[PDB]
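Exercise 7. Predict the joint structure of the components listed below.
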Amino acid sequence: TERRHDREFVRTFFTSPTAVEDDSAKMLRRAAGLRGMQAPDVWVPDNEDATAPSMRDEGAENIVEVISEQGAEFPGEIHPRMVWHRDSPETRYQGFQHMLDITDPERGAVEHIHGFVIPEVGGIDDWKKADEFFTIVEHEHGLDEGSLAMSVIIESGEAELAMGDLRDEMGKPTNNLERLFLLVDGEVDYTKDMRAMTPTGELPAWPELRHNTSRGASAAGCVAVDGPYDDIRDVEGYRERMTDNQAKGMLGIWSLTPGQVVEANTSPLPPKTGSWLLDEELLGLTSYVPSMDDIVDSMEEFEWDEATYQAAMTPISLFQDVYENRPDQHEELEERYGAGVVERAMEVG
Amino acid sequence: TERRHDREFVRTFFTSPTAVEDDSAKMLRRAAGLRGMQAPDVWVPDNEDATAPSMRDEGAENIVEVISEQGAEFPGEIHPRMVWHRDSPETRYQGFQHMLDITDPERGAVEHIHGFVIPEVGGIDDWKKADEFFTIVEHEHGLDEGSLAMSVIIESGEAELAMGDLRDEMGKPTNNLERLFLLVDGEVDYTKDMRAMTPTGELPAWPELRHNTSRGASAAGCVAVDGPYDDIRDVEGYRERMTDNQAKGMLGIWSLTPGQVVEANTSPLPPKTGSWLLDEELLGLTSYVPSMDDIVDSMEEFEWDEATYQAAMTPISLFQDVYENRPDQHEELEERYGAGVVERAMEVG
Amino acid sequence: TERRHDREFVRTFFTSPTAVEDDSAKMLRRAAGLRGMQAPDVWVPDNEDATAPSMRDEGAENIVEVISEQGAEFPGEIHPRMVWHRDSPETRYQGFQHMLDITDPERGAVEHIHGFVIPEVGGIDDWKKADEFFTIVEHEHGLDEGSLAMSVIIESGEAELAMGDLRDEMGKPTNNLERLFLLVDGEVDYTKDMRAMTPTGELPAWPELRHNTSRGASAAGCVAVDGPYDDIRDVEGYRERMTDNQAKGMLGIWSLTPGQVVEANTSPLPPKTGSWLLDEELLGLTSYVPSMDDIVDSMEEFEWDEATYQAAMTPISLFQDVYENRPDQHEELEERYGAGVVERAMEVG
Ligand SMILES: [Cl-]
Ligand SMILES: [Cl-]
Ligand SMILES: [Cl-]
Ligand SMILES: [Cl-]
Ligand SMILES: [Cl-]
Ligand SMILES: [Cl-]
Ligand SMILES: [Cl-]
Ligand SMILES: [Cl-]
Ligand SMILES: [Cl-]
Ligand SMILES: [Cl-]
Ligand SMILES: [K+]
Ligand SMILES: [K+]
Ligand SMILES: [K+]
Ligand SMILES: [K+]
Ligand SMILES: [K+]
Ligand SMILES: [K+]
Ligand SMILES: [K+]
Ligand SMILES: [K+]
Ligand SMILES: [K+]
Ligand SMILES: [K+]
Ligand SMILES: [K+]
Ligand SMILES: [K+]
Ligand SMILES: [Mg+2]
Ligand SMILES: [Mg+2]
Ligand SMILES: [Mg+2]
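Solution:
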């Protein structure tokens, strides 16, 4: 099975906020200035999670201003991320509308744009809705069919499975799914969707998701990439995961800073020298396990970005479900958290 | 994707024998008396594996006697387990017949019954046979369509795969598979079906089965639960697995005793206090590896419940297959087990 | 689900070159002399990877000469491996042609041949092409339909997935896929196909591939087997993997030497004695990590069999992709490898 895109491999997939609460295109203009090993193979001005939602309409204008003035020199491929969601026609329509604004050829961005990145997709028929949107945007703006590459973030159970019959869905003459380019794991939301929880709240490793995504990319002629690694300071951990991914055939990974771009650009390359193997630094050695109360102070005082919120919303949710349906447990639950904490936890949206 | 059931989460799935070889409803009457943290979110009077087969017709009567007299006060949901098997129309018919007896509304049980648990299912079309049985039972007894929740034990290769296209099978207008509620791993029989074997005979961990089941529950709007943890004394191991499951998004687990119900009810809840992390007790420290002879003494003298039998039937089976088809090996096999052990092992049903 | 073949289990799957660059049937004639624990349950004269390609037409004649003169006494089942490839009609046609030569009943081999082993298969419709070839070979040579067992090496992403709907594909009246017997992992080429890479170049472990293959064999009534373990000297490692496989329900494994046949024949059998568990030898303790330069000396001087070549072709390929598309990185890449190494690496076919 063969890849349909100019980039046979992609080591770095680097996101930037598109409009910050100054010159709101700040992050974009600098990220566009990156050259050499500090530049990602793929650059993602991110109008989705990186960007506060009320900044999002401005983000799309900034995407057009910055790629307009500066896209031409940017050495990698550019693929901004739209909003989208398998469960939310308004979000779908929003993403398509931004996509349509961004690509108006009279504005100078489109010709430096290689494609777009569609977060939160569902089952294959949700992928077909996005693909249909790309087809329409292309037609409205005299671009060639298939020229906008679509890449998807795999971040629900449904989308992990959808990778299974992609080879044959993709060849139906009623979609243009050949446009698929990257299959990008999104451990953060995948964790929410799967209702998983860890005692520290660090992402579970999901080796099977990563296998499944490497498999799907290989069987369908796409390129697999792994998702953000948030602990930016933990250079060793980031290299350890990239090495683990490389043993899955997942060869690119998300980068969050220009230092991550450098680690990421370098890791899959063979080392300079040979090597022989044998049979406040304290912070990178400490992980905290929050208490019910910790988590409810924290949430309470959040009203940490969205994703820290939703992550903890799980044990709290399991708590609320339990509280709502187990009167018989009401007493022992209180005898264990204090009556104050309990009806405080009950209050978390 | 959304859950169709009153219980958004289920931490404990607790089984009890329905008729023991006294008052044979003993186990049921006491388990029905459980309140607070000793009570499971889901209670499973088990007319299948917990119960000797010749006690099974009596079990179904006891299910009706006990839930009749006592169901009304039971604080969790009640879901008795029927017999069933993808390979055995008699078993299927038996399960449906017990189901039909149990729900006669003139008997007082049905109104405290939330649904049933169907063991040993196969490919999705085997799930449709069970669902058809629920539909018919409902109609015969003026219950509302879909009101009996069906939960399945995932304990064959076929049923692990069947979870893959569930979202779309479930929406066909010819089944009522929306009734699905729990997807419950059954490591014990899954191990038999997959012909796996371990040197101690302890269950392999099957992280992928558990991933696959969390994924399937999330993509189809069901709740994932893990299977019995037999080493009841190994409190640490049970918490270690529940924690491992929780990192898969598998949040409930089977409980075999009221102490397991307590561990299980407590584990997925956030801890009371914060915690900081840094980079004849002898029996819980010893595992025996049986010898061919051990295993044949043991089996021989069994003629350990069913499942210990079937588990060891695997290496013995591989032995018999080998013996039947490799005359050239007959000599070295004997020179290694003794001629006595060999034709003794050859005799194991 | 039930197995359709004489051998319910298969512990050893042993390959031999069919024609070596003397008497080119050497390897075959001796391997055919093996008896007892040194004999595999399944013997694979290998006209594919074991054999240089220009020796392949001679291999097929040797298969007929040796099985002719000696097949009758060989105590296991015999299943030679043909060439094949999901991407290469010439290879497919070649495999079928050798298969057709081999089975001419006037030549004495066919009656000691149990079936054939088809490497490199793709999606299920590629399996149907091979099956069609078996059907035709059978008909041309008055053999009974279905009497040649087909076994496949699982060594692409596509073929791992193809195992998913096998139970139902297999029952269509337009193929004879009941003939399926073994599902054999091929970690070596699977690693290429998935574009995985390890720092030592040792095969990644691919537990999920192995799970998926045990699952597929169980759901479809085939027997799962694992792929070659190249480090022939590492007896401990080979037993450790076989034990790991056995916990997946993968009970046979590839053997490369008569000593591996002996380990392999013995490992899944229960131990002789009980056992109690508690809570230049230097070479088997050293692994080398090659440098870019190492890998390019090595490749350069290869123009190590095919598979060592293709394996390293991955980081080199990722290097070339990067070099071709990242001018901005050209300077730092050189400042790190030397300008000599770089345009030398650029030259690797
Ligand atoms: Cl929707
Ligand atoms: Cl984890
Ligand atoms: Cl899978
Ligand atoms: Cl890839
Ligand atoms: Cl049946
Ligand atoms: Cl294990
Ligand atoms: Cl769940
Ligand atoms: Cl082809
Ligand atoms: Cl590995
Ligand atoms: Cl098997
Ligand atoms: K999101
Ligand atoms: K298409
Ligand atoms: K089209
Ligand atoms: K891959
Ligand atoms: K059973
Ligand atoms: K339905
Ligand atoms: K219906
Ligand atoms: K889940
Ligand atoms: K090959
Ligand atoms: K067929
Ligand atoms: K047929
Ligand atoms: K198996
Ligand atoms: Mg996300
Ligand atoms: Mg069972
Ligand atoms: Mg191969």
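Discussion. Chain B is about 45% helix and 15% strand.
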